[PDB]
Write a protein that binds this DNA or RNA. Structure first.
Lengths: 99, 76, 97, 111, 80, 98, 83, 109, 96
DNA sequence: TCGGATGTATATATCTGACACGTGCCTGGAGACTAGGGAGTAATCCCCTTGGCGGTTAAAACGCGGGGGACAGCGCGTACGTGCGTTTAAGCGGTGCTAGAGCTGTCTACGACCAATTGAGCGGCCTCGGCACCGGGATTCTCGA
DNA sequence: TCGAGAATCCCGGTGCCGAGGCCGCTCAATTGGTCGTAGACAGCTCTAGCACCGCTTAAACGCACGTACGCGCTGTCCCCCGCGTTTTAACCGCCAAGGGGATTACTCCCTAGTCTCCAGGCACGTGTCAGATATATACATCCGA
C-alpha cells in the first residue's frame, strides 16, 4: 500500500525547516510589481532603486511574521488549534493599530 | 609539553611547560624570554579567558596548542 | 576620477573585535549593522543629554549630563558597568597630560 | 620653539574609539551652545563598552556553530538570547536575522 | 492591474509556518492581503513625500529608512 | 418577601453611574503613603509636592482603566463573561510588556 | 519614619469601582493580587525616573515637572499640570 | 523721523504672536539660521488647530446647557472625532473621564 | 517683592474663542490644557523641521520645511486645510 | 400577559467663590543700516535604471480520499452577587515651626577662535583561504501490525 | 508491544570570490596663545511642607443565602491535509540606449548684528453672577403573580 503520513507531522517538519533558515519567502517580481502599482497612485513616472525594494520586502515580511505569531497566541487562548480572522482582528485591536 | 603562542603581529614563540604547571610560571617565563611586565598580557585559548590561580591541567591543554596573546597598555 | 570620502566606524569595530576574539573575521553586512547600531545609540544619548541640559536653563554640555542620560537610558547592570567605565576613562584622561 | 610630538587625545585616555571625531560631531550636531572638554571621553568609553559586549556575545554564538566569521544570524542570536540587550533593542529589526526556534507546547503530538 | 493576487497562497502558508502556526483556516488570505496593502500604502506614502521634498525623481533606499524610523520601526543593515 | 434584584442589574447601574462621572476612585491618604514608601527605596529623606502626587494618581488610574478595558475584551473573546487573571496576562503579553 | 505593609491600602471596592468604570460586569476572586502587582511595578518605574530627574538638579523635593517629564519619557504624556 | 510701529501679526492678519514664535525658534537650538517666513506659517497652523478644537468643545459644552468649558467637554470633543483622536492617540487629559459604551453581550436578554 | 514674569498663550486662545463663540467662557484647567497642547504641537513640528533640514545638508529652515513637516505629521484633511491656511497667511504677509 | 415599589429625572430658592476687567509699568519687540556668506543657476560627466529575448526547470495550480477537529447540546455543583448589622479610619478645621526653594553680587577658571603642520584614515589592487556545492553512506524518526 | 520505509546528518573532495593587507596622499586633528563671560560660591528672605489634635460620619468588614454560569462529557458532520498529475512564469544570462544623479564655478540677495525708541503683555486688586446644594415632586423601570 502507498505510504501516507498522519495529518500533522508534515506541518511540524515545515515549521522546523522554515524557522531554522533565514531566506525570503515571497517571490521578488510580484512584490516589485505590487510596490510599483501602489506607489503609482501618489506620483506619476517614478523610479526605484533596488535596495529600496529589498528594504520594503524585509520590513513587510518581519511585520507579517510578528502579526502571525500574535494571532497564533490569540487562537490558542480560546481552546483551539486553527487561526481564524477574528483572531487577527482581536490582535490588531489590542495592539492599538486598528482604531 | 610544547605549546606555540601567537601575538597580534603573527609573532609565534615556542614554550615548554608541564601540565601540572600553573600559568603564573608561564608569565614569569615570558618575562624571562621577553620582559613584558606581567600585568598587560591577556591570554585567550579558543575564546576563553584564563583564571590566574587555576593551573594548566584543569584547562585540558594539548601538545602543539595555539594560545593567543594580546597587550592592553592600560597606561593613563 | 573624483570620489567623495565617507566616514564609518569600521576600523575601530575591527580593533575591538580583534582585542576580544583573537581569531575571528567579520562580513560586510555585520559591519553595516554595527555601524547603524553605534550611530543610533550615539544619537539617542546626545539627544537626551541636550534635552536635559535645556531643562535646567544651562548652555553647556558636561560629563554630568552624559552620566545622567546614560543612567536614564540603559537598564540596570548595563548602566552600572557603563558608568564605571566612563568615570574610569575620565579619571585616567584627567590624570595624564 | 620646538613643538613636541603629537599625541592623540584617545591615546591619553587609553581608548580605541576616536575622541576628536566625537567632539566634532557633538559640536556640529546642534545640541548645545558650547560643549565641555570631558563629554567626548565619556561617550567614547560607553560606546566602546557596548560594542565590546555585543561583539563578545556574537563571537561566542558564531563559535558554537563551527565558523570563523560573524554573519547577521549570529548577531541576532546573541541579541535575542540576552534579556537586557533584548530590552534595549525592543523596536529594532535586523536584516537577514530570522526568528528564535520555539514551538508552543500544546501543538506537540500526543502520547 | 490586480497585482495584489501575486501574493499567492503558499507564500502566506510559508510565512505562517515560520511564525509557528500549525493549522490554517480558509479565510486568512484576504485579511493578510488587506493588512499588507495598508502597511505598504502608509510606508510608500511617507517615502514618496520625502523624495518629493528632496526635489528628485528616483526614490533612494535611505528615505525608506527614514520613513520606517518615523513609525518606530527602525531597520538595520541598509546604510542607516 | 423583601424585594431583591436579580444578579446583574446593580452591576449595569454602577457601570452607567461610574461612566457618567469624572472624579477619582482610589482614596487619597493610602495612595500617598504607598507613594512615599515606594520612593523611599531610592533615596532617604525625600519630600513631595502635592501636585506630583495628584499627577501620579491620575496617570495610574488612567492606566488601570485602559488595562481593564482590554482585559474585558480578551475575556469576551473566549465565550465568557467573568474576567480571570489569564486574560490580564494575555493582554499584557500582546501589548508588548514583559 | 519607616513604612511597611501599605500595598493593602488599595482596597477591594476601589478595584471594583475601577473595573465598573472600565465596563466589566463579573469579576473573579483572584484579580486583586494581579492588579496590586501591576500597579506596584508601574509606580516603581515612574518614581525611579522622577527621582533620578530630581537628583540631577541637586534638589531635595520632587516637583510636578519631574513627574511630567518622567511620564513623557515613556510615551504616555499628560496634560493639565504644566509644561 | 520715524513711523508708527505695526506688529507683524497685524500685517499677516492673525491673532497669534509672530515675534514670540520667531524668538522661540531662534533660541530653541533647531538650526543655525531661521528664515523670514517660518513664523507666519507656524502661527497660522497653530491658530487653525486651536480654532477647530475650541469650536468642537464649545458645541459640546452648549449641548449640556452650560456656559463655560471644563475638561470633560474637551475630552468629549476630542474622543468623538476621528482625525483629532488619531492625532492625540497617546495623550491623557486630566479630569476627562471615558465614553459611555457597553458591549452588546452583557445586556440583559 | 513681586515675582518674575511667566509667559503663556492665554490671551490669544481667549481671543480665538471669542472669535468663534461670542458668548462662551472658559475655566482655568481648560486654559492649562490648551497651553500644553499648543506647546506640544509646536515642539513636534519644530523638531521634525529641524531633522528634515539636517538630512538635506542645509543650514537654515524656511517655509518649505514647515510645509513638509506639516504634511508629514498631521492626517489628511487637517494637513490640507492647514497647508491652505499657511499659504494664505504667507502670501498675505508678503503682499504688504 | 398586569401592578406595586424603587431609583432617577425635573423644577425652584440661595448663596458663595472664581471669572472677567481696569491700571502701571517695564521689558521685549519694532524701525533703520551695514557686511558677508549661503544658496540659486548654468554647464558637464557618466553611472545606473529601464527595456527586450531565449530557455529551463522548479514552483504553482487542480483534483480526490478521508480522518480529526469545531460546534451544539446536556447535567451539575460551586463560586459570586445582594442585602444587613458592625466597626474602622478617612476627611475637615484649625495651630506651630522651620527646612529649603528662590533671588542677588562677584570673581575666577574654562571654552571659542586663529595660524602652522603633520600623521591618521580613506581610495585603489590583489591574493589566496574559508565557505559553498555534489555525491555517498549511517543514522533517526514515523506508522501499520 | 515490534519492523519496513523515508528524511536527515556527517563525511570527503573541488572550485571560486570576497575579505584582509599594502601604498600613496590630502585634509583634519594638534599645538600654542589670547580674550571674554558662565557659572560656582556666599548671603539673605520668605513660603509651603511636615507634624499634631479633635470630631463626625461615611465607607469598609463580616456573614448568610440563593442561583446562574463555568466546566466536563458525548455525538455529528464537514473541511483541511497529504499526495499525484499537469501547466506556467521566475530566474538567469546577455545586449542596448539614455535620463537623471553628482560635481564645479559664479554671483546677487537675505539674514545676523547693532542702536534707539515705545507700547503691549503681565502682576495686582475688585465686583458680581454661574453654578453647586438642598428640597420637593413626577415619571421610568424592574420583578412577581
Amino acid at each position: 500500500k502507498p505510504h501516507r503520513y498522519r495529518p500533522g507531522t508534515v506541518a511540524l517538519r515545515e515549521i522546523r525547516r522554515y524557522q531554522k533558515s533565514t531566506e525570503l519567502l515571497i517571490r521578488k517580481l510580484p512584490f516589485q510589481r505590487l510596490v510599483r502599482e501602489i506607489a503609482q497612485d501618489f506620483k506619476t513616472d517614478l523610479r526605484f532603486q533596488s535596495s529600496a525594494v529589498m528594504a520594503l520586502q524585509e520590513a513587510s515580511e518581519a511585520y507579517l511574521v510578528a502579526l502571525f505569531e500574535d494571532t497564533n497566541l490569540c487562537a490558542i487562548h480560546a481552546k483551539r488549534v486553527t487561526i481564524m480572522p477574528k483572531d487577527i482582528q482581536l490582535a490588531r485591536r489590542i495592539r492599538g493599530e486598528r482604531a | 609539553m610544547q605549546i606555540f603562542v601567537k601575538t597580534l603581529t603573527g609573532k609565534t614563540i615556542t614554550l615548554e611547560v608541564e601540565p601540572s604547571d600553573t600559568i603564573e610560571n608561564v608569565k614569569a617565563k615570558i618575562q624571562d624570554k621577553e620582559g613584558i611586565p606581567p600585568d598587560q598580557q591577556r591570554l585567550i585559548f579558543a575564546g576563553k579567558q584564563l583564571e590566574d590561580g587555576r593551573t594548566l591541567s584543569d584547562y585540558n591543554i594539548q601538545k602543539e596548542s595555539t594560545l593567543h596573546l594580546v597587550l592592553r597598555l592600560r597606561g593613563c | 576620477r573624483r570620489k567623495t570620502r565617507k566616514e564609518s566606524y569600521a576600523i575601530y569595530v575591527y580593533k575591538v573585535l580583534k582585542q576580544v576574539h583573537p581569531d575571528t573575521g567579520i562580513s560586510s553586512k555585520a559591519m553595516s549593522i554595527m555601524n547603524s547600531f553605534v550611530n543610533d545609540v550615539f544619537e539617542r544619548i546626545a539627544g537626551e543629554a541636550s534635552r536635559l541640559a535645556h531643562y535646567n536653563k544651562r548652555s553647556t554640555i558636561t560629563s554630568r549630563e552624559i552620566q545622567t542620560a546614560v543612567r536614564l537610558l540603559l537598564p540596570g547592570e548595563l548602566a552600572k558597568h557603563a558608568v564605571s567605565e566612563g568615570t574610569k576613562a575620565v579619571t585616567c584622561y584627567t590624570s595624564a597630560k | 620653539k620646538t613643538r613636541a610630538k603629537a599625541k592623540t587625545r584617545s591615546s591619553r585616555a587609553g581608548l580605541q574609539f576616536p575622541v576628536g571625531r566625537v567632539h566634532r560631531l557633538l559640536r556640529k550636531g546642534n545640541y548645545a551652545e558650547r560643549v565641555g572638554a570631558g563629554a567626548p571621553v565619556y561617550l567614547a568609553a560607553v560606546l566602546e563598552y557596548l560594542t565590546a559586549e555585543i561583539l563578545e556575545l556574537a563571537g561566542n554564538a558564531a563559535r558554537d556553530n563551527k565558523k570563523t566569521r560573524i554573519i547577521p544570524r549570529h548577531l541576532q542570536l546573541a541579541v535575542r538570547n540576552d534579556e537586557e540587550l533584548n530590552k534595549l533593542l525592543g523596536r529594532v529589526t535586523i536584516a537577514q536575522g530570522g526568528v528564535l526556534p520555539n514551538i508552543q507546547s500544546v501543538l506537540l503530538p500526543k502520547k | 492591474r490586480d497585482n495584489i493576487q501575486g501574493i499567492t497562497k503558499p507564500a502566506i502558508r510559508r510565512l505562517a509556518r515560520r511564525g509557528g502556526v500549525k493549522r490554517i483556516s480558509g479565510l486568512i488570505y484576504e485579511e493578510t492581503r488587506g493588512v499588507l496593502k495598508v502597511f505598504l500604502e502608509n510606508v510608500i506614502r511617507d517615502a514618496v513625500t520625502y523624495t518629493e521634498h528632496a526635489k528628485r525623481k528616483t526614490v533612494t533606499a535611505m528615505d525608506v529608512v527614514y520613513a520606517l524610523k518615523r513609525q518606530g520601526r527602525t531597520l538595520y543593515g541598509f546604510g542607516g
